[PDB]
């Protein structure tokens, strides 16, 4: 599995996200509860967690391969992702394989992504 | 299943994007120039243009397989995503494999993704 060649623009520092209570938060200030509340109000969307099992360098430049356990039943998915790709980790906040690189592209502060990190995402119900 | 980078960025709905020049634009109001006008601005930022070479349905319902020619060297890359995944197309704007579904989920006007479409984004030089 190979990730989309493009990243969503809202990762840029200073970008504003629209929260479910009508709230607007700067992308760097996002919290887990923001995802939770946004999914809760939305009839269309639900929250989904993916635990990181393994992290490894790819054969392609600026790309790392990450094994995820996706959702309930822990579905096994390996994806080639850019080392700069920010993930939002449960109880942690923004995390990428190359935080310093994320700081260059999006100027987004990131923890180092590690095994055991639970990545939260918005998904369909 | 689908790993976090594969999933559509549903939290981009109603977002306000911060451009590299310091300008602000609502996500639905983004233009191709905004990617290009921000291309020359810094040293690290660069425009990655991935041309869709193929669009095929997948055995998985509501999922499409897209082949891209990626970057300057035109690397062949196959990506499996939900049909409503937004891409920003050169001279077109927001597009996906299911414009109607993208419009409902992301609350934006959406065109149809085509084998001619050039998908653009911000990557590193």
Short mmCIF file of C-alpha atoms in Angstrom, two decimals:
data_model
loop_
_atom_site.label_atom_id
_atom_site.label_comp_id
_atom_site.label_asym_id
_atom_site.label_seq_id
_atom_site.Cartn_x
_atom_site.Cartn_y
_atom_site.Cartn_z
CA UNK A 1 0.00 0.00 0.00
CA UNK A 2 1.31 3.42 -1.02
CA UNK A 3 0.08 6.70 0.49
CA UNK A 4 -1.24 9.64 -1.58
CA UNK A 5 1.63 11.70 -3.10
CA UNK A 6 0.00 14.84 -1.71
CA UNK A 7 -0.63 16.12 1.81
CA UNK A 8 -3.65 18.15 2.93
CA UNK A 9 -2.84 21.89 3.19
CA UNK A 10 -4.27 22.35 6.71
CA UNK A 11 -1.05 20.95 8.19
CA UNK A 12 0.57 24.35 7.59
CA UNK A 13 1.20 26.21 10.84
CA UNK A 14 -1.41 28.88 11.49
CA UNK A 15 -4.08 27.05 9.51
CA UNK A 16 -7.47 27.02 11.21
CA UNK A 17 -9.55 23.90 11.83
CA UNK A 18 -13.34 24.03 12.32
CA UNK A 19 -14.40 22.22 15.51
CA UNK A 20 -17.82 20.68 16.21
CA UNK A 21 -18.80 23.16 18.94
CA UNK A 22 -18.37 25.90 16.34
CA UNK A 23 -14.87 26.40 17.68
CA UNK A 24 -11.89 27.35 15.56
CA UNK A 25 -8.50 26.01 16.62
CA UNK A 26 -5.04 26.53 15.17
CA UNK A 27 -3.89 23.19 13.75
CA UNK A 28 -0.89 22.97 16.09
CA UNK A 29 -3.18 23.37 19.12
CA UNK A 30 -5.39 20.39 18.25
CA UNK A 31 -6.20 17.94 21.04
CA UNK A 32 -7.58 14.40 21.10
CA UNK A 33 -10.90 15.57 22.56
CA UNK A 34 -11.32 17.80 19.50
CA UNK A 35 -11.37 14.66 17.34
CA UNK A 36 -13.68 12.92 19.82
CA UNK A 37 -16.21 15.75 19.99
CA UNK A 38 -16.09 16.33 16.23
CA UNK A 39 -16.83 12.66 15.57
CA UNK A 40 -19.52 12.58 18.25
CA UNK A 41 -21.63 15.43 16.86
CA UNK A 42 -21.19 14.32 13.24
CA UNK A 43 -23.75 11.76 12.12
CA UNK A 44 -21.52 11.01 9.13
CA UNK A 45 -18.17 10.57 10.88
CA UNK A 46 -16.71 8.39 13.62
CA UNK A 47 -13.31 8.23 15.31
CA UNK A 48 -10.87 5.45 14.38
CA UNK A 49 -7.58 4.46 16.00
CA UNK A 50 -4.55 2.82 14.41
CA UNK A 51 -1.77 1.51 16.63
CA UNK A 52 1.73 1.60 15.16
CA UNK A 53 3.25 -1.89 15.22
CA UNK A 54 6.47 -1.24 13.32
CA UNK A 55 8.47 1.55 11.67
CA UNK A 56 11.14 1.11 8.99
CA UNK A 57 12.98 3.02 6.27
CA UNK A 58 11.81 2.52 2.69
CA UNK A 59 13.89 2.05 -0.45
CA UNK A 60 12.53 5.39 -1.66
CA UNK A 61 14.09 8.71 -0.54
CA UNK A 62 12.29 10.65 2.19
CA UNK A 63 9.93 7.72 2.70
CA UNK A 64 9.46 5.31 5.61
CA UNK A 65 7.34 2.15 5.77
CA UNK A 66 5.00 1.89 8.76
CA UNK A 67 2.97 -1.15 9.79
CA UNK A 68 -0.41 -0.27 11.31
CA UNK A 69 -2.95 -2.28 13.24
CA UNK A 70 -6.15 -0.67 11.98
CA UNK A 71 -9.38 -0.42 13.97
CA UNK A 72 -10.98 -3.24 15.92
CA UNK A 73 -9.61 -6.70 15.05
CA UNK A 74 -6.31 -4.87 14.39
CA UNK A 75 -6.22 -5.13 10.60
CA UNK A 76 -2.63 -5.30 9.37
CA UNK A 77 -1.68 -2.58 6.89
CA UNK A 78 1.80 -1.53 5.81
CA UNK A 79 2.18 1.83 4.07
CA UNK A 80 5.02 3.79 2.53
CA UNK A 81 4.72 7.27 3.99
CA UNK A 82 6.85 10.40 3.77
CA UNK A 83 9.02 10.69 6.88
CA UNK A 84 7.57 14.18 7.35
CA UNK A 85 3.94 13.03 7.43
CA UNK A 86 2.36 14.20 10.69
CA UNK A 87 0.15 11.71 12.51
CA UNK A 88 -1.97 12.77 15.46
CA UNK A 89 -1.18 10.38 18.30
CA UNK A 90 -3.73 9.67 21.04
CA UNK A 91 -2.85 11.44 24.28
CA UNK A 92 0.25 12.85 22.59
CA UNK A 93 -0.44 15.20 19.69
CA UNK A 94 1.32 15.67 16.36
CA UNK A 95 3.95 13.04 15.59
CA UNK A 96 5.93 12.17 12.47
CA UNK A 97 8.91 10.01 11.55
CA UNK A 98 10.92 13.15 10.84
CA UNK A 99 9.66 15.97 13.14
CA UNK A 100 12.46 18.28 12.01
CA UNK A 101 11.31 17.86 8.41
CA UNK A 102 7.70 18.61 9.37
CA UNK A 103 9.01 21.81 10.93
CA UNK A 104 10.40 22.80 7.54
CA UNK A 105 7.38 22.06 5.35
CA UNK A 106 4.47 22.91 7.67
CA UNK A 107 6.35 24.48 10.60
CA UNK A 108 4.36 22.01 12.71
CA UNK A 109 5.97 20.86 16.00
CA UNK A 110 6.02 17.06 16.18
CA UNK A 111 7.02 14.30 18.57
CA UNK A 112 8.96 11.38 17.11
CA UNK A 113 6.51 8.68 16.03
CA UNK A 114 7.15 5.42 17.88
CA UNK A 115 5.90 1.84 18.10
CA UNK A 116 2.78 1.66 20.25
CA UNK A 117 1.55 5.11 19.26
CA UNK A 118 -2.20 5.16 18.73
CA UNK A 119 -3.01 7.36 15.75
CA UNK A 120 -6.49 8.87 15.73
CA UNK A 121 -8.27 9.73 12.49
CA UNK A 122 -11.73 10.74 11.31
CA UNK A 123 -13.47 7.98 9.35
CA UNK A 124 -16.92 7.14 8.01
CA UNK A 125 -19.37 5.34 10.30
CA UNK B 1 -8.56 -1.65 5.93
CA UNK B 2 -6.86 1.70 5.35
CA UNK B 3 -3.92 3.27 7.16
CA UNK B 4 -4.19 6.88 8.47
CA UNK B 5 -2.37 8.49 5.52
CA UNK B 6 -4.65 6.68 3.06
CA UNK B 7 -7.80 8.04 4.72
CA UNK B 8 -9.39 11.29 3.48
CA UNK B 9 -8.60 14.32 5.68
CA UNK B 10 -12.22 14.95 6.78
CA UNK B 11 -11.04 17.54 9.31
CA UNK B 12 -10.15 19.80 6.39
CA UNK B 13 -13.85 20.58 6.01
CA UNK B 14 -14.54 24.24 6.77
CA UNK B 15 -10.83 24.82 7.41
CA UNK B 16 -8.95 28.07 6.80
CA UNK B 17 -5.55 27.58 5.16
CA UNK B 18 -2.49 29.69 5.97
CA UNK B 19 -0.47 30.43 2.83
CA UNK B 20 3.34 30.75 2.85
CA UNK B 21 3.18 34.50 2.18
CA UNK B 22 1.13 35.05 5.32
CA UNK B 23 -2.17 35.24 3.44
CA UNK B 24 -5.26 33.33 4.56
CA UNK B 25 -7.75 31.44 2.41
CA UNK B 26 -10.79 29.30 3.15
CA UNK B 27 -10.12 25.80 1.83
CA UNK B 28 -12.91 25.94 -0.76
CA UNK B 29 -11.44 29.19 -2.09
CA UNK B 30 -7.98 27.75 -2.84
CA UNK B 31 -6.56 28.33 -6.32
CA UNK B 32 -3.72 26.79 -8.34
CA UNK B 33 -1.89 30.11 -8.12
CA UNK B 34 -1.91 29.88 -4.32
CA UNK B 35 0.22 26.75 -4.60
CA UNK B 36 2.41 28.35 -7.28
CA UNK B 37 2.62 31.81 -5.69
CA UNK B 38 3.86 30.05 -2.56
CA UNK B 39 6.30 27.92 -4.55
CA UNK B 40 8.89 30.64 -5.25
CA UNK B 41 8.60 32.13 -1.77
CA UNK B 42 10.80 29.86 0.36
CA UNK B 43 13.83 27.76 -0.53
CA UNK B 44 12.68 24.39 0.80
CA UNK B 45 9.13 24.50 -0.58
CA UNK B 46 8.55 22.99 -4.01
CA UNK B 47 5.60 21.98 -6.18
CA UNK B 48 5.12 18.23 -6.57
CA UNK B 49 2.89 17.56 -9.56
CA UNK B 50 1.58 14.00 -9.75
CA UNK B 51 -0.30 13.17 -12.94
CA UNK B 52 -3.03 10.55 -12.66
CA UNK B 53 -2.20 7.88 -15.22
CA UNK B 54 -5.02 5.52 -14.32
CA UNK B 55 -8.27 5.29 -12.36
CA UNK B 56 -9.72 1.87 -11.59
CA UNK B 57 -12.35 0.57 -9.19
CA UNK B 58 -11.29 -1.85 -6.48
CA UNK B 59 -12.93 -5.02 -5.20
CA UNK B 60 -13.38 -3.02 -2.01
CA UNK B 61 -16.61 -0.98 -2.36
CA UNK B 62 -16.30 2.81 -2.49
CA UNK B 63 -12.57 2.47 -3.08
CA UNK B 64 -10.61 3.48 -6.19
CA UNK B 65 -7.11 2.60 -7.36
CA UNK B 66 -5.13 5.50 -8.81
CA UNK B 67 -1.83 5.25 -10.66
CA UNK B 68 0.33 8.37 -10.52
CA UNK B 69 3.40 9.58 -12.35
CA UNK B 70 5.15 11.11 -9.36
CA UNK B 71 7.63 13.98 -9.36
CA UNK B 72 10.28 15.01 -11.87
CA UNK B 73 11.24 11.42 -12.71
CA UNK B 74 7.63 10.26 -13.20
CA UNK B 75 7.72 7.37 -10.72
CA UNK B 76 4.83 4.95 -11.20
CA UNK B 77 2.83 4.82 -7.97
CA UNK B 78 -0.40 2.95 -7.24
CA UNK B 79 -2.65 4.39 -4.53
CA UNK B 80 -5.79 2.79 -3.07
CA UNK B 81 -8.19 5.32 -1.50
CA UNK B 82 -11.83 6.03 -0.69
CA UNK B 83 -13.44 7.55 -3.78
CA UNK B 84 -14.17 10.84 -2.00
CA UNK B 85 -10.49 11.61 -1.34
CA UNK B 86 -9.91 15.25 -2.39
CA UNK B 87 -7.05 16.11 -4.74
CA UNK B 88 -6.20 19.62 -5.91
CA UNK B 89 -5.89 19.60 -9.70
CA UNK B 90 -3.83 22.08 -11.73
CA UNK B 91 -6.15 24.47 -13.58
CA UNK B 92 -9.12 22.67 -12.03
CA UNK B 93 -9.05 22.67 -8.24
CA UNK B 94 -10.55 20.21 -5.78
CA UNK B 95 -11.40 16.92 -7.50
CA UNK B 96 -12.04 13.30 -6.57
CA UNK B 97 -13.36 10.01 -7.93
CA UNK B 98 -16.77 10.88 -6.49
CA UNK B 99 -17.41 14.68 -6.64
CA UNK B 100 -20.93 14.36 -5.21
CA UNK B 101 -19.67 12.41 -2.19
CA UNK B 102 -16.78 14.82 -1.69
CA UNK B 103 -19.20 17.75 -1.75
CA UNK B 104 -21.36 16.17 0.96
CA UNK B 105 -18.47 15.13 3.22
CA UNK B 106 -16.07 18.06 2.75
CA UNK B 107 -18.68 20.75 2.01
CA UNK B 108 -16.99 22.04 -1.16
CA UNK B 109 -17.51 22.20 -4.94
CA UNK B 110 -15.70 19.23 -6.47
CA UNK B 111 -14.76 18.24 -10.02
CA UNK B 112 -14.20 14.76 -11.43
CA UNK B 113 -10.71 13.29 -11.17
CA UNK B 114 -9.41 12.29 -14.60
CA UNK B 115 -6.48 10.58 -16.30
CA UNK B 116 -5.50 14.03 -17.55
CA UNK B 117 -5.51 15.67 -14.13
CA UNK B 118 -2.29 17.02 -12.63
CA UNK B 119 -2.43 16.78 -8.84
CA UNK B 120 -0.28 19.37 -7.08
CA UNK B 121 0.98 19.88 -3.53
CA UNK B 122 3.86 21.17 -1.40
CA UNK B 123 6.94 18.98 -1.06
CA UNK B 124 10.63 19.54 -0.38
CA UNK B 125 13.37 20.37 -2.88
#
